[PDB]
Amino acid sequence: TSTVTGGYAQSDAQGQMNKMGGFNLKYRYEEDNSPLGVIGSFTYTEKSRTASSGDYNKNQYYGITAGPAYRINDWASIYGVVGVGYGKFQTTEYPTYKNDTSDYGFSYGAGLQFNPMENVALDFSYEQSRIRSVDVGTWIAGVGYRF
Incomplete structure (x- = not known):
């Protein structure tokens, strides 16, 4: 049916x-006919900020990731993630006199879910992203539910 997972x-x-920290939400779909699973997750991460800082946000990290998924027992699942990342810097409502500015790269990784509970699941995954001049090691982990 469907599975929810994020953290x-x-x-x-x-x-x-x-370092940076963002939230990841992903949707999953599978068919009872076979163990085929495809998931789509979105991630938004930003640099840490202090209370003294204003309400302005320097740069933002948007990314797309999705991959196949296989079902193993009622407490073990495995999946992969592929896609890109977007880096927005010096963003302003006014024109910057430039045709366009965007910094992106590709991401890849996979993880597993485990839990001694029929409706509760925890999983850990790791993925690296490279944007020509920026290389960060990001991992996504949280909970998992299955309808």
Whole structure:
């Protein structure tokens, strides 16, 4: 039927200052005929901020990821993630006198879910992304539910 899974993702930032953290939500679909599973997850991560900081956000991290999924026993699932990332820097409502500015890269990884509960699931996964000059190691982990 369908499975819900999401949590938070922290990663190291080579070329960037301070690590980042975002939220990941993903939807899953499978057919009883075979163990075929496809999932689509979105991630949004930003640099940590302090209370003294204003309400402005420096850059944002948007990304797309999805991959196949296989069912193993009632407490073990495996999946992979593939897609890209978007880096928005110096974003302003006014024109920047530039044709366009965008920094992106590709991501890849996979993880597994485990839990001694029929309706509760916890999973860990790791994925790396490279954007020509930026390389960070991000991992996504949280909960999982199956209708």
